[PDB]
Amino acid sequence: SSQIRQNYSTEVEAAVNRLVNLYLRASYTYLSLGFYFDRDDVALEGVCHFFRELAEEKREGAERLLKMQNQRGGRALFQDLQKPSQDEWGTTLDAMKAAIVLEKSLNQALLDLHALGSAQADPHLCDFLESHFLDEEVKLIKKMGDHLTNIQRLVGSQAGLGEYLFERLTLKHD
Amino acid sequence: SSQIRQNYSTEVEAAVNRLVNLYLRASYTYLSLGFYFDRDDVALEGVCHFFRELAEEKREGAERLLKMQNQRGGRALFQDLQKPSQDEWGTTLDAMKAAIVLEKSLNQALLDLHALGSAQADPHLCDFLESHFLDEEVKLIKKMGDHLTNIQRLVGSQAGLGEYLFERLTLKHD
Amino acid sequence: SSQIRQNYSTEVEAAVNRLVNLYLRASYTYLSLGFYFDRDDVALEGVCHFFRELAEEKREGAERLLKMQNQRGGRALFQDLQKPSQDEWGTTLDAMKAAIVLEKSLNQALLDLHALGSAQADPHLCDFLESHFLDEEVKLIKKMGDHLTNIQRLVGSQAGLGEYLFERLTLKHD
Amino acid sequence: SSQIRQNYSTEVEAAVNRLVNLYLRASYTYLSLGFYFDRDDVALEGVCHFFRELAEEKREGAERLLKMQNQRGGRALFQDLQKPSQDEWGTTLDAMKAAIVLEKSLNQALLDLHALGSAQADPHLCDFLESHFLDEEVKLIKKMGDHLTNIQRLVGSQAGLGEYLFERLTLKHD
Numbered sequence: 001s002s003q004i005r006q007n008y009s010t011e012v013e014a015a016v017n018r019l020v021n022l023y024l025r026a027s028y029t030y031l032s033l034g035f036y037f038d039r040d041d042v043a044l045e046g047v048c049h050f051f052r053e054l055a056e057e058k059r060e061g062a063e064r065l066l067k068m069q070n071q072r073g074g075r076a077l078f079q080d081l082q083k084p085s086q087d088e089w090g091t092t093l094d095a096m097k098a099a100i101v102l103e104k105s106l107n108q109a110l111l112d113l114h115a116l117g118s119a120q121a122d123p124h125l126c127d128f129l130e131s132h133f134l135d136e137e138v139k140l141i142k143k144m145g146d147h148l149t150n151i152q153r154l155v156g157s158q159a160g161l162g163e164y165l166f167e168r169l170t171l172k173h174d
Numbered sequence: 175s176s177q178i179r180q181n182y183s184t185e186v187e188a189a190v191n192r193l194v195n196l197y198l199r200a201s202y203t204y205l206s207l208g209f210y211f212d213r214d215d216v217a218l219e220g221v222c223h224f225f226r227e228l229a230e231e232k233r234e235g236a237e238r239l240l241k242m243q244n245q246r247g248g249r250a251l252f253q254d255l256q257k258p259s260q261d262e263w264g265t266t267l268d269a270m271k272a273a274i275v276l277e278k279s280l281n282q283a284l285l286d287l288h289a290l291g292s293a294q295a296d297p298h299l300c301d302f303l304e305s306h307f308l309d310e311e312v313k314l315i316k317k318m319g320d321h322l323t324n325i326q327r328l329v330g331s332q333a334g335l336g337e338y339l340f341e342r343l344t345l346k347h348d
Numbered sequence: 349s350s351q352i353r354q355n356y357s358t359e360v361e362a363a364v365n366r367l368v369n370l371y372l373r374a375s376y377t378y379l380s381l382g383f384y385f386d387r388d389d390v391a392l393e394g395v396c397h398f399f400r401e402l403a404e405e406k407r408e409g410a411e412r413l414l415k416m417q418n419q420r421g422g423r424a425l426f427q428d429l430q431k432p433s434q435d436e437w438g439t440t441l442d443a444m445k446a447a448i449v450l451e452k453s454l455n456q457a458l459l460d461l462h463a464l465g466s467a468q469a470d471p472h473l474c475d476f477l478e479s480h481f482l483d484e485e486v487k488l489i490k491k492m493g494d495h496l497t498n499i500q501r502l503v504g505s506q507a508g509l510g511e512y513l514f515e516r517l518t519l520k521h522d
Numbered sequence: 523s524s525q526i527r528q529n530y531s532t533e534v535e536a537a538v539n540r541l542v543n544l545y546l547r548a549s550y551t552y553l554s555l556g557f558y559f560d561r562d563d564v565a566l567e568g569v570c571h572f573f574r575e576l577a578e579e580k581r582e583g584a585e586r587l588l589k590m591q592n593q594r595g596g597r598a599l600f601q602d603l604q605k606p607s608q609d610e611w612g613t614t615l616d617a618m619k620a621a622i623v624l625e626k627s628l629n630q631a632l633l634d635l636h637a638l639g640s641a642q643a644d645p646h647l648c649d650f651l652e653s654h655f656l657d658e659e660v661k662l663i664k665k666m667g668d669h670l671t672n673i674q675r676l677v678g679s680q681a682g683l684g685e686y687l688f689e690r691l692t693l694k695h696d
């Protein structure tokens with residue numbers, strides 16, 4: 001079973017497993033976003049790359065949670081992973097709006113788990129989230145907000161031009 | 175007190191202290207401009223960087239004045255530093271117009287102090303301003319005037335597009 | 349306005365702006381201390397350098413606070429910056445005593461803001477202060493306390509000798 | 523005679539020759555100061571080195587004046603060089619006080635010549651002094667004032683100790 005578990009509540013253990021599911025769901029959403037922007041009828045390489053990188057980052061966050069679960073003596077439990085909310089993601093603007101909604105949901109889940117840890121007097125859990133998740137999420141949401149503002153300023157009366165220019169001049173591409 | 179002071183009028187000493195205040199005020203104005211352009215709802219990185227660099231340059235000018243005050247045997251006297259004239263700075267165009275107004279005010283203060291030094295037959299003071307301040311200010315005002323012209327040509331009927339393009343293609347960013 | 353703000357109270361936002369003012373005030377106090385020790389009638393280079401470095405450190409702390417304010421979606425608001433409490437700072441001992449009073453005031457402000465963040469369940473704020481401010485301040489206050497003890501032991505009946513020796517043999521100079 | 527002279531008054535030409543004499547006199551004074559501190563019954567190596575370096579600097583200033591005299595088409599005229607004002611120079615404090623008196627006299631001579639050049643509308647002369655002499659002299663007088671303050675603080679009731687320590691810990695020696 002476990003000979004190591006200490007100060008690790010069943011409530012935190014379950015909440016960590018749920019958060020793993022949320023991060024893997026987010027990773028899957030970003031995989032879908034990335035491949036949508038690689039369609040020949042969409043063809044925005046920088047947008048594709050932005051979301052493919054986020055799919056990897058969310059996968060890695062799930063793996064860090066799972067490592068920690070085992071370090072604490074809890075037990076990973078995996079659930080079905082629901083498919084993303086859309087099959088087609090619209091414009092870069094639509095996609096970036098969906099991404100910031102997703103990230104705020106992950107951030108609230110992190111804050112909720114931190115509050116549970118606080119309540120349970122679990123400082124290792126609280127430290128873990130502070131050190132590896134909370135600032136990473138604030139930084140990412142600030143980046144997305146920056147991007148949304150620039151996308152919005154480029155719409156003008158010439159949406160296609162603006163969408164090309166943002167992809168070319170802000171996002172990273174070959 | 176001082177055993178070194180020679181040919182250094184009380185009028186120049188006081189005017190140097192006032193100029194220190196003006197440069198520190200200018201530095202504070204540029205700090206505010208820089209952080210405004212870093213807002214997620216403004217998000218013009220090149221504009222942010224332009225003004226953050228000027229905040230550092232004006233700080234350094236104040237420090238050079240203070241070093242000189244002591245080299246001459248005058249006494250630094252610091253006054254309260256008023257907050258910048260605005261909390262929000264509008265568009266890049268509004269900000270660059272405010273910056274050139276600010277720089278012309280600093281330039282007139284430099285010219286006034288040079289004229290006082292001339293009147294007081296203080297060639298070290300006059301040399302000091304010629305060598306470290308007057309051309310730096312002319313160069314900067316020419317740069318700002320160049321930028322204003324380019325910003326103005328980009329307004330068109332598509333202001334957001336123009337403001338993005340200027341930030342991307344003229345100003346230095348990551 | 350902001351599309352990123354999440355779990356960031358108006359109370360914390362205002363307190364961060366106040367703390368910016370306190371750090372910029374502290375920076376200004378250290379600028380004045382530094383230039384006082386550069387006077388030809390004071391002439392303690394190591395003391396000058398010690399306080400000029402602190403002016404830069406406090407400026408940088410204010411800039412880190414302002415970056416964080418924007419990362420969280422709050423709005424920087426700048427106030428007038430009061431001049432330092434003295435125009436002349438006495439002996440190295442007087443100056444180091446004033447510095448530790450100043451640092452304890454900054455430390456209490458940090459602790460107060462941490463307590464507000466705790467109360468508001470704002471773990472990103474609390475982490476931010478823990479990671480970038482609290483230990484830096486404890487380290488600095490310990491250094492100043494060390495210096496005060498050494499300065500005090502050197503007073504003897506030969507104050508000028510002691511003040512020279514401390515500057516020469518403890519503080520960093522050319 | 524000269525085929526190059528232009529805008530170079532006889533008054534400036536004569537004043538340049540006088541200034542050469544003053545600089546060579548100063549160099550000779552510093553040679554004497556240096557060798558006094560090398561006496562086995564004085565034996566303050568750092569003090570010796572300080573004044574020997576100034577003897578070289580004043581020689582070089584005279585040579586720069588003579589080069590300029592020829593560049594302008596004036597004619598060098600050399601006069602007898604009076605011996606220094608003392609044969610023995612007392613303590614480091616006495617010597618540093620004599621040095622700052624000497625430097626203020628050179629500085630006033632520079633300022634007087636600058637004023638003559640101004641009056642004669644001789645901008646090359648004025649530039650020459652600004653570029654190669656005025657700031658060098660302000661810097662040196664500030665250094666000497668710094669040293670005087672430190673020497674004075676070290677007198678205490680233990681003059682010999684203070685004089686040793688200043689030589690050892692402020693002045694450059696082997």
Ligand SMILES: [Cl-]
Pocket residue numbers: 082083
């Ligand atoms: Cl589903």
Ligand SMILES: [Cl-]
Pocket residue numbers: 256257428
């Ligand atoms: Cl005001």
Ligand SMILES: [Cl-]
Pocket residue numbers: 254430431
């Ligand atoms: Cl005040």
Ligand SMILES: [Cl-]
Pocket residue numbers: 604605
């Ligand atoms: Cl004689």
